[PDB]
Design an enzyme around this catalytic site. Structure first.
Site, PDB file in Angstrom:
ATOM      1  N   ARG A  54    -119.906 -59.349 -63.083  1.00  0.00           N
ATOM      2  CA  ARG A  54    -120.726 -59.691 -64.242  1.00  0.00           C
ATOM      3  C   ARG A  54    -119.866 -60.406 -65.273  1.00  0.00           C
ATOM      4  O   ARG A  54    -118.917 -59.829 -65.804  1.00  0.00           O
ATOM      5  CB  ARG A  54    -121.365 -58.445 -64.864  1.00  0.00           C
ATOM      6  CG  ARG A  54    -122.174 -58.735 -66.133  1.00  0.00           C
ATOM      7  CD  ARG A  54    -122.517 -57.460 -66.910  1.00  0.00           C
ATOM      8  NE  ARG A  54    -123.771 -56.854 -66.471  1.00  0.00           N
ATOM      9  CZ  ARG A  54    -123.960 -55.545 -66.337  1.00  0.00           C
ATOM     10  NH1 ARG A  54    -122.973 -54.700 -66.601  1.00  0.00           N
ATOM     11  NH2 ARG A  54    -125.136 -55.082 -65.935  1.00  0.00           N
ATOM     12  N   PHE A  59    -118.907 -63.167 -74.489  1.00  0.00           N
ATOM     13  CA  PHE A  59    -119.029 -61.712 -74.469  1.00  0.00           C
ATOM     14  C   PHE A  59    -117.832 -61.118 -73.722  1.00  0.00           C
ATOM     15  O   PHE A  59    -116.854 -60.702 -74.347  1.00  0.00           O
ATOM     16  CB  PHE A  59    -120.362 -61.286 -73.839  1.00  0.00           C
ATOM     17  CG  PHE A  59    -120.616 -59.788 -73.851  1.00  0.00           C
ATOM     18  CD1 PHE A  59    -119.847 -58.927 -74.620  1.00  0.00           C
ATOM     19  CD2 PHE A  59    -121.636 -59.250 -73.077  1.00  0.00           C
ATOM     20  CE1 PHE A  59    -120.085 -57.559 -74.610  1.00  0.00           C
ATOM     21  CE2 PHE A  59    -121.881 -57.885 -73.067  1.00  0.00           C
ATOM     22  CZ  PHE A  59    -121.106 -57.038 -73.834  1.00  0.00           C
ATOM     23  N   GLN A  62    -116.498 -58.683 -66.516  1.00  0.00           N
ATOM     24  CA  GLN A  62    -116.499 -57.317 -65.995  1.00  0.00           C
ATOM     25  C   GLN A  62    -116.164 -57.276 -64.503  1.00  0.00           C
ATOM     26  O   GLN A  62    -116.648 -58.107 -63.731  1.00  0.00           O
ATOM     27  CB  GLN A  62    -117.866 -56.669 -66.249  1.00  0.00           C
ATOM     28  CG  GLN A  62    -117.981 -55.231 -65.769  1.00  0.00           C
ATOM     29  CD  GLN A  62    -119.319 -54.606 -66.129  1.00  0.00           C
ATOM     30  OE1 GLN A  62    -120.053 -55.126 -66.972  1.00  0.00           O
ATOM     31  NE2 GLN A  62    -119.642 -53.488 -65.492  1.00  0.00           N
ATOM     32  N   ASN A 101    -119.039 -48.363 -68.429  1.00  0.00           N
ATOM     33  CA  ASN A 101    -119.578 -47.048 -68.118  1.00  0.00           C
ATOM     34  C   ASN A 101    -121.096 -47.040 -68.016  1.00  0.00           C
ATOM     35  O   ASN A 101    -121.760 -48.059 -68.267  1.00  0.00           O
ATOM     36  CB  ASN A 101    -119.079 -45.994 -69.121  1.00  0.00           C
ATOM     37  CG  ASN A 101    -119.599 -46.224 -70.539  1.00  0.00           C
ATOM     38  OD1 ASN A 101    -120.797 -46.438 -70.755  1.00  0.00           O
ATOM     39  ND2 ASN A 101    -118.697 -46.163 -71.516  1.00  0.00           N
ATOM     40  N   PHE A 112    -113.780 -54.160 -68.324  1.00  0.00           N
ATOM     41  CA  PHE A 112    -114.060 -55.506 -68.781  1.00  0.00           C
ATOM     42  C   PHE A 112    -112.978 -56.027 -69.702  1.00  0.00           C
ATOM     43  O   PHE A 112    -112.260 -55.251 -70.336  1.00  0.00           O
ATOM     44  CB  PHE A 112    -115.451 -55.615 -69.423  1.00  0.00           C
ATOM     45  CG  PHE A 112    -115.667 -54.713 -70.619  1.00  0.00           C
ATOM     46  CD1 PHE A 112    -115.989 -53.368 -70.455  1.00  0.00           C
ATOM     47  CD2 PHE A 112    -115.601 -55.228 -71.909  1.00  0.00           C
ATOM     48  CE1 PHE A 112    -116.217 -52.552 -71.559  1.00  0.00           C
ATOM     49  CE2 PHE A 112    -115.828 -54.418 -73.016  1.00  0.00           C
ATOM     50  CZ  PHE A 112    -116.136 -53.080 -72.843  1.00  0.00           C
ATOM     51  N   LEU A 121    -119.414 -52.009 -79.364  1.00  0.00           N
ATOM     52  CA  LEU A 121    -119.004 -51.132 -78.271  1.00  0.00           C
ATOM     53  C   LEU A 121    -118.031 -50.043 -78.734  1.00  0.00           C
ATOM     54  O   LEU A 121    -117.694 -49.140 -77.965  1.00  0.00           O
ATOM     55  CB  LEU A 121    -118.403 -51.946 -77.122  1.00  0.00           C
ATOM     56  CG  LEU A 121    -119.353 -52.988 -76.521  1.00  0.00           C
ATOM     57  CD1 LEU A 121    -118.693 -53.749 -75.384  1.00  0.00           C
ATOM     58  CD2 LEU A 121    -120.613 -52.304 -76.029  1.00  0.00           C
ATOM     59  N   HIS A 125    -117.319 -47.314 -75.572  1.00  0.00           N
ATOM     60  CA  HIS A 125    -116.435 -47.669 -74.470  1.00  0.00           C
ATOM     61  C   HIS A 125    -114.987 -47.432 -74.862  1.00  0.00           C
ATOM     62  O   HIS A 125    -114.590 -47.741 -75.983  1.00  0.00           O
ATOM     63  CB  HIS A 125    -116.668 -49.122 -74.049  1.00  0.00           C
ATOM     64  CG  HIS A 125    -118.031 -49.358 -73.482  1.00  0.00           C
ATOM     65  ND1 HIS A 125    -118.266 -49.447 -72.125  1.00  0.00           N
ATOM     66  CD2 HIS A 125    -119.241 -49.470 -74.082  1.00  0.00           C
ATOM     67  CE1 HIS A 125    -119.560 -49.626 -71.917  1.00  0.00           C
ATOM     68  NE2 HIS A 125    -120.175 -49.640 -73.087  1.00  0.00           N
TER      69      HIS A 125
HETATM   70  C1  LIG Z   1    -124.041 -52.242 -75.338  1.00  0.00           C
HETATM   71  O1  LIG Z   1    -123.428 -51.881 -74.082  1.00  0.00           O
HETATM   72  C2  LIG Z   1    -123.438 -52.914 -73.184  1.00  0.00           C
HETATM   73  C3  LIG Z   1    -124.407 -53.905 -73.291  1.00  0.00           C
HETATM   74  C4  LIG Z   1    -124.435 -54.949 -72.380  1.00  0.00           C
HETATM   75  C5  LIG Z   1    -123.510 -54.983 -71.344  1.00  0.00           C
HETATM   76  O2  LIG Z   1    -123.541 -56.003 -70.436  1.00  0.00           O
HETATM   77  C6  LIG Z   1    -124.863 -56.511 -70.200  1.00  0.00           C
HETATM   78  C7  LIG Z   1    -122.510 -54.013 -71.225  1.00  0.00           C
HETATM   79  C8  LIG Z   1    -121.622 -54.218 -69.947  1.00  0.00           C
HETATM   80  C9  LIG Z   1    -120.478 -55.211 -70.452  1.00  0.00           C
HETATM   81  C10 LIG Z   1    -119.846 -54.355 -71.556  1.00  0.00           C
HETATM   82  C11 LIG Z   1    -119.518 -53.341 -70.465  1.00  0.00           C
HETATM   83  N1  LIG Z   1    -120.810 -52.989 -69.902  1.00  0.00           N
HETATM   84  C12 LIG Z   1    -121.175 -51.858 -69.324  1.00  0.00           C
HETATM   85  O3  LIG Z   1    -120.399 -50.908 -69.202  1.00  0.00           O
HETATM   86  C13 LIG Z   1    -122.556 -51.863 -68.668  1.00  0.00           C
HETATM   87  N2  LIG Z   1    -122.690 -50.704 -67.800  1.00  0.00           N
HETATM   88  C14 LIG Z   1    -122.496 -50.838 -66.500  1.00  0.00           C
HETATM   89  O4  LIG Z   1    -122.263 -51.938 -65.993  1.00  0.00           O
HETATM   90  N3  LIG Z   1    -122.639 -49.730 -65.789  1.00  0.00           N
HETATM   91  C15 LIG Z   1    -122.462 -49.694 -64.340  1.00  0.00           C
HETATM   92  C16 LIG Z   1    -121.345 -48.676 -64.082  1.00  0.00           C
HETATM   93  C17 LIG Z   1    -121.476 -47.722 -63.080  1.00  0.00           C
HETATM   94  C18 LIG Z   1    -120.456 -46.799 -62.862  1.00  0.00           C
HETATM   95  C19 LIG Z   1    -119.302 -46.824 -63.642  1.00  0.00           C
HETATM   96  N4  LIG Z   1    -118.325 -45.937 -63.426  1.00  0.00           N
HETATM   97  C20 LIG Z   1    -119.176 -47.776 -64.648  1.00  0.00           C
HETATM   98  C21 LIG Z   1    -120.197 -48.700 -64.870  1.00  0.00           C
HETATM   99  C22 LIG Z   1    -122.530 -52.935 -72.126  1.00  0.00           C
END
Ligand SMILES: COc1ccc(OC)c([C@H]2CCCN2C(=O)CNC(=O)NCc2ccc(N)cc2)c1
Length: 164
Positions: A54, A59, A62, A101, A112, A121, A125
């Site tokens: 991703r 931004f 990831q 997460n 990321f 965040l 995070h």
């Molecule tokens: C406001 O919080 C966010 C909003 C948008 C976003 O990307 C669309 C994110 C993405 C990039 C910033 C990091 N992030 C996340 O952590 C999105 N969550 C996941 O991708 N979760 C899947 C997952 C599954 C298992 C584990 N251990 C970690 C992540 C977070």
């Protein structure tokens, strides 16, 4: 001494260069140790060969899902998930390294690298490091992202490890 680790990154099989990361073991030792060991692969698994799945311009980039290779997976060296260690370090700007997460206390292996200040965040995070060298590579990765996060090239961590 805080570990220095590296990620060598390809796009469609063409080398982009090396991202060097300082892991703030002085602030978040458990989170730093997890990332460090996943870079060396010393537990028998880790980041080598996995992708940036991703990537969203202006931004973050990831990566880290080496189990399911689609953003749903990954695991830590401690077990499937581990707690949020603390939120002492903030998402202050481009180059910040932070754990992805699925809610509180669900750190695995996904991480990321920020390409902007992502202050929203903070407290959600766990920040655990920053880019020492290779923001140019991070910008290249970023350029192959999209609004939806879908990548236009296959972005692979071909090699990774510890420098010190
Ligand atoms: C406001 O919080 C966010 C909003 C948008 C976003 O990307 C669309 C994110 C993405 C990039 C910033 C990091 N992030 C996340 O952590 C999105 N969550 C996941 O991708 N979760 C899947 C997952 C599954 C298992 C584990 N251990 C970690 C992540 C977070």
């Amino acid at each position: 001494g805080n570990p220095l680790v590296y990620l060598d990154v390809d796009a469609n099989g063409k080398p982009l260069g090396r991202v060097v990361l300082e892991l703030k073991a002085d602030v978040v030792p458990k989170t730093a140790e997890n990332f460090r060991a996943l870079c060396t692969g010393e537990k028998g698994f880790g980041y080598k060969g996995s992708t940036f799945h991703r990537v969203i311009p202006s931004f973050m980039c990831q990566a880290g899902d080496f189990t399911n290779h689609n953003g749903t997976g990954g695991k830590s060296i401690y077990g499937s998930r581990f707690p949020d260690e603390n939120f002492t370090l903030k998402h202050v700007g481009p180059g910040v390294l932070s754990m992805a997460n699925a809610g509180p206390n669900t750190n695995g292996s996904q991480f990321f690298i920020c390409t902007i200040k992502t202050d929203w965040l903070d407290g959600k995070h766990v920040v655990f490091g920053h880019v020492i060298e290779g923001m140019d590579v991070v910008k290249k990765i970023e350029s192959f992202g999209s609004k939806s996060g879908r990548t236009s090239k296959k972005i692979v961590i071909t090699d990774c490890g510890q420098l010190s």
